[PDB]
């Protein structure tokens, strides 16, 4: 079994602007993390990682 990991950055002004204009930004960056994890899982099935065996 293995482990995967990402991260993202946000400020206070961006949070307030997202909550005031009706278009949040936190969710749009959180979805990218799930999509990246899915892509990494896809790459490890049809292709392999020779250093990772």
């Amino acid at each position: 079994v293995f482990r995967l990991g990402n991260a993202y950055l946000i400020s206070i002004d961006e949070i307030k602007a997202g909550q005031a204009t009706g278009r949040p930004l936190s969710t749009r960056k959180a979805s990218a993390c799930q999509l990246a994890h899915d892509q990494l899982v896809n790459r490890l099935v049809f292709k392999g990682s020779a250093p990772h065996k």
């Binding site: 950055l9 961006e14 990218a32 999509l35």
Partner: protein, 152 residues
């Protein structure tokens, strides 16, 4: 990059890793500055630093940072406060086609775009090279106190 990938790898002017970064928030712009590209420090007025795009005979200071609240036009305009990555690991702009040797000191020219490696002192090339639009993007390991302005 490009097709066969769900996500584009990276975009210029954004941090790559979360490892000991430093961002200056007290800065003012003199001209139009694009994300990426090194900047100079023309002078200091009452604490804040007046930064410009890199020119001839100037020591680079940091790489411009991308914020989605401050700049709503895709670039940093004149007379606007901006964030500069004084220290950390950021994606920069380059005019190259092949990745240089690992841990090689990069050189800057034109409007802060990387022209080549094989330098003597300065920042170093981390592991990263991606294609963007028509061109490539290089990863730069910014370190504070790296470039010392020459004495007159």
């Amino acid at each position: 990059a490009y097709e066969n990938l769900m996500l584009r790898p990276a975009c210029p002017g954004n941090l790559s890793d979360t490892s000991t970064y430093n961002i200056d928030g007290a800065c003012v712009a003199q001209g139009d500055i694009e994300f990426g590209s090194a900047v100079q420090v023309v002078g200091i007025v009452d604490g804040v630093k007046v930064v410009t795009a890199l020119s001839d005979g100037g020591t680079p200071y940091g790489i411009a940072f991308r914020s989605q609240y401050e700049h709503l036009s895709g670039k940093i305009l004149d007379g606007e406060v901006c964030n500069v990555v004084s220290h950390g690991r950021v994606w920069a702009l380059t005019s190259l086609d092949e990745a240089p040797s690992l841990f090689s000191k990069l050189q800057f020219g034109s409007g802060g775009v990387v022209t080549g490696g094989s330098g003597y002192a300065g920042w170093t090339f981390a592991g990263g090279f991606v294609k963007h639009e028509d061109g490539y993007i290089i990863e730069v390991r910014v370190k504070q106190n790296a470039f010392i302005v020459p004495p007159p």
